[PDB]
From a paper:
The JN.1-sublineage KP.3.1.1 recently emerged as the globally prevalent SARS-CoV-2 variant, demonstrating increased infectivity and antibody escape. We investigate how mutations and a deletion in the KP.3.1.1 spike protein (S) affect hACE2 binding and antibody escape. The spike proteins exhibited three conformational states: “one RBD up,” “all RBD down,” and “flexible” (i.e., one or two RBDs disordered in the density maps due to flexibility).
Additionally, we also determined apo spike protein structures of engineered JN.1-derived mutants carrying S31Δ, F456L, and Q493E. Using 3D variability analysis, we quantified the particle proportion for each conformational state and found that S31Δ did not affect the proportions of “one RBD up” and “all RBD down” particles by comparing the proportion of JN.1.11 and other spike proteins that have S31Δ. Besides, while F456L alone did not affect hACE2 binding (JN.1.11.1 has F456L compared to JN.1.11), Q493E alone substantially reduced binding affinity, which is also consistent with prior research and is likely due to the electrostatic repulsion between hACE2-E35 and RBD-E49317. RBD-Q493E alone in the presence of F456 would likely be disfavored due to an electrostatic repulsion with hACE2-E35. Q493E alone reduced hACE2 binding, while F456L by itself had minimal impact on the binding; however, hACE2 binding with the Q493E mutation was recovered in the context of F456L (JN.1.11 + S31Δ+Q493E vs. KP.3.1.1).
Residue numbers in the entry:
A (entry chain C): 610 to 677, 689 to 709
B (entry chain B): 710 to 827, 849 to 1153
C (entry chain A): 860 to 959
D (entry chain A): 710 to 759
E (entry chain A): 1010 to 1059
F (entry chain C): 1110 to 1153
Write the structure that this text describes.
Amino acid sequence: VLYQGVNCTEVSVAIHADQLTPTWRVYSTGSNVFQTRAGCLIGAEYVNNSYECDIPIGAGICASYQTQSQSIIAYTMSLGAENSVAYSN
Amino acid sequence: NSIAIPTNFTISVTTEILPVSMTKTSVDCTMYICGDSTECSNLLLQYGSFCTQLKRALTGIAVEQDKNTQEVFAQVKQIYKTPPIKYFGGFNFSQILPDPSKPSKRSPIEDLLFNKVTLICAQKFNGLTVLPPLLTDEMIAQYTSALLAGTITSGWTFGAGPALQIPFPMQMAYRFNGIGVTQNVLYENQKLIANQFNSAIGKIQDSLFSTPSALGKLQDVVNHNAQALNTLVKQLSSKFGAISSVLNDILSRLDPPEAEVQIDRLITGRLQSLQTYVTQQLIRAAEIRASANLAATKMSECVLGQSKRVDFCGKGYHLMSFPQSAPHGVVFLHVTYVPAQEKNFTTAPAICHDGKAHFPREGVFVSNGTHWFLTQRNFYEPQIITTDNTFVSGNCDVVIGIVNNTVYDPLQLELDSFKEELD
Amino acid sequence: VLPPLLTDEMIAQYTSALLAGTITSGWTFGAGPALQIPFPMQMAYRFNGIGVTQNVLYENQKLIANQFNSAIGKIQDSLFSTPSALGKLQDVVNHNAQAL
Amino acid sequence: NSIAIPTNFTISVTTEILPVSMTKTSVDCTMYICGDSTECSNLLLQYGSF
Amino acid sequence: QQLIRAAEIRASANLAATKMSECVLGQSKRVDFCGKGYHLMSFPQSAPHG
Amino acid sequence: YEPQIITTDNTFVSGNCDVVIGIVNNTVYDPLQLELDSFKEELD
Ligand SMILES: *[C@@H]1O[C@H](CO)[C@@H](O[C@@H]2O[C@H](CO)[C@@H](O[C@@H]3O[C@H](CO)[C@@H](O)[C@H](O)[C@@H]3O)[C@H](O)[C@H]2NC(C)=O)[C@H](O)[C@H]1NC(C)=O
Ligand SMILES: *[C@@H]1O[C@H](CO)[C@@H](O[C@@H]2O[C@H](CO)[C@@H](O[C@@H]3O[C@H](CO)[C@@H](O)[C@H](O)[C@@H]3O)[C@H](O)[C@H]2NC(C)=O)[C@H](O)[C@H]1NC(C)=O
Ligand SMILES: *[C@@H]1O[C@H](CO)[C@@H](O[C@@H]2O[C@H](CO)[C@@H](O[C@@H]3O[C@H](CO)[C@@H](O)[C@H](O)[C@@H]3O)[C@H](O)[C@H]2NC(C)=O)[C@H](O)[C@H]1NC(C)=O
Ligand SMILES: *[C@@H]1O[C@H](CO)[C@@H](O[C@@H]2O[C@H](CO)[C@@H](O)[C@H](O)[C@H]2NC(C)=O)[C@H](O)[C@H]1NC(C)=O
Ligand SMILES: *[C@@H]1O[C@H](CO)[C@@H](O[C@@H]2O[C@H](CO)[C@@H](O)[C@H](O)[C@H]2NC(C)=O)[C@H](O)[C@H]1NC(C)=O
Ligand SMILES: *[C@@H]1O[C@H](CO)[C@@H](O[C@@H]2O[C@H](CO)[C@@H](O)[C@H](O)[C@H]2NC(C)=O)[C@H](O)[C@H]1NC(C)=O
Ligand SMILES: *[C@@H]1O[C@H](CO)[C@@H](O)[C@H](O)[C@H]1NC(C)=O
Ligand SMILES: *[C@@H]1O[C@H](CO)[C@@H](O)[C@H](O)[C@H]1NC(C)=O
Ligand SMILES: *[C@@H]1O[C@H](CO)[C@@H](O)[C@H](O)[C@H]1NC(C)=O
């Protein structure tokens, strides 16, 4: 889930205080809470590896279901492979 | 019988600014109409799926805006990089290429464009939110850099197959042949052309920096979105015939029946305000889509190619274009060939030699008062009239306005140089 | 109803300028300064553009001029005779009138 | 192995008609809804900036 | 309704301007863009609202 | 890629050697002169 426009600290506090309006809870264990510019993403593990975008989240960040068993992984999307052109005179 | 032919030329750079994307908004329909009020929400349920339709319309717009950005900028198969030595025949691209010394890795022109146009939605935070773009400004800058590196090092090859390196002056030589000017014009005048290009780019920076209205097309989009949201928020203060604009006061003083009447008046007014806002956003989205489709077409035909369409890629004969990223849009720098310093020459449709009509193969017959020469149409370069430069079709009498002049056949003179006496 | 910013005379002047430019300079005036060229040579270049050699125009110049003049006369007869020829503009006028 | 090639040609002129502009209109909102009526205008003010 | 009509007229005007630039001020290789046949040249004429 | 011999028919001449930046030295073959040479120049 993505809580849009909110800090992960505010969401965590609202969870601990039993203030958040929806009554469902995501496990929200270690490494599954990641702060994006779009909002607080809970239930996805951020990886440094960049991959092509699958499910867009926002502000450059995408997520997909990957084998690492499998889980939902959040990542910064790749724009393409690099190709340095052998330019010369 | 009078034709004017350029004896010089100017390399000109013009700027075209196009919107690509619109601010992506979302609305919590229930919070806007019936914020923190159960009674109002229950009355709102009797109007059917209006909030659902409004949500779908705004979601569709947001997705469309990401589609527009993706279609305009993500047109390159690979992220291309320039060589470590920024030497391209004497052409200076340092003002359009990314500057590695600054964060965001944008070019000087892109920084100017970003500075001229003006995360947490502290303002208008009444159930109205703004979603970030899917691609960040850095990602757009990377696509622009890849497109520039591709164009500079590979010309149009990378846009229709694999990227193939070519020296930049030869890329220009082919672009000159495209407009209809021979390669030797570029090579003999290569330094002049590079100097005119560099001057034109400096003028682009001075023009955009000096004139505050240069980017009005993008600022108008930002301002119209701001006005639409300021109006939508302002409408919450209207009473629409109710005793009060605040639902909490209506519920605080009145019993359910009267509160329901006053709330229905407010629900009707707020719902009309949201329906108007969404309709306006859909119309604006259609306009932005058309602009984004034009920008993508120009990206493909002006930057990844060379276009023969008049005024499509700027005024003059098109040579090449360079994209630059801008907030909510794209700026194209169009490099064109502009004829200059024309001279008036006498012309003729054909030359009569020995009863035969000679026509130019690739050029125009001109006369400098006393002598006839063949020149290319877009650049004065007189050449001797020969059997290689012209073709023969029909007799002399048929062409209207035909003139008498010698057509030189190199073969016969060469044969005459070889002794005909034999003994 | 607000008047247009450009009057019908101003639009006619722009059209006349465009016709004078095209007729006397071909495409040169649209991408740089206007350069005069004799009209038959402008057509010769237009023929090369489509992929027909210049001698076809010059040998058949009178036929081409006659066909052009005939076609223009036919344009006037077609537009004058058929009341529906301009429906695309009349529909705009009618839709604005219906809306008001 | 058969190709057809023109031996003659015709110069043709066709007509294309395109709209460019629409009648420019303006509306006095207050006069249309509440013409020459102060009481109606005062009620109209409660609907906000329509 | 006027905004929707304005969008349609804008699209038409943009097409007319493109045709003015590519058909009248140039020569176009685009099939059927500047009429049927191989394009030679075009001439504009003013008309009410178009 | 389709390599061909550099000839006076494949290329055109404009200006002298010195003006072009990066010009290289290579033979340009003129078929006419070789053909002429095949036709006996001795005459006797
Ligand atoms: C390609 O062009 C750039 C400029 O367009 C050349 O780099 C240097 O850019 C600065 C821009 O600021 C030029 O002016 C400088 O301005 C500051 C004040 O802003 C002043 O304190 C400096 O003394 C200088 O005047 C600078 O002149 C320019 N360099 C030169 C040699 O003119 C870049 O060198 C060009 N690349 C090549 C390969 O020529
Ligand atoms: C075609 O036009 C170009 C310009 O559009 C001509 O090049 C220009 O030639 C003039 C005179 O030679 C240059 O002016 C000189 O500039 C130097 C700069 O240091 C200055 O010291 C001199 O006192 C004088 O002002 C001008 O800069 C130059 N422009 C460029 C861009 O190089 C060219 O000669 C013309 N060719 C023909 C055949 O007409
Ligand atoms: C190619 O086609 C054109 C027409 O599209 C041919 O020109 C036409 O030739 C005929 C016969 O020579 C002309 O008809 C004659 O017109 C005169 C007018 O005074 C009339 O008195 C005669 O009794 C007869 O009707 C016709 O007008 C003419 N069309 C034009 C526009 O000039 C041309 O000959 C054809 N060429 C070839 C090689 O097939
Ligand atoms: C037209 O051009 C021709 C050749 O381009 C000019 O003739 C040359 O003029 C120069 C003048 O210094 C002489 O040195 C050459 O020997 C001339 N060559 C020939 C073949 O005549 C001619 O003068 C030019 N005329 C005008 C009016 O510009
Ligand atoms: C080009 O030269 C030819 C001759 O080679 C000219 O033809 C002559 O024109 C005169 C005009 O009075 C006639 O009397 C001769 O009988 C013609 N001779 C031939 C062989 O045709 C022709 O007029 C010249 N054209 C121009 C424009 O000067
Ligand atoms: C191409 O060949 C010419 C000679 O035919 C070279 O010109 C000579 O260059 C040397 C360089 O030191 C000079 O000393 C000679 O005086 C030049 N002679 C002439 C007649 O110009 C030219 O440099 C060669 N070019 C290349 C790239 O090798
Ligand atoms: C969230 O709050 C912490 C509090 O220390 C702050 O450091 C962080 O920058 C905040 N992030 C956002 C996105 O608001
Ligand atoms: C191209 O030539 C210039 C001449 O100054 C030189 O500095 C540059 O290094 C050359 N490029 C390569 C790739 O050798
Ligand atoms: C064109 O050149 C001729 C001389 O060749 C001159 O008489 C005429 O006035 C010139 N026209 C213009 C517009 O420069």
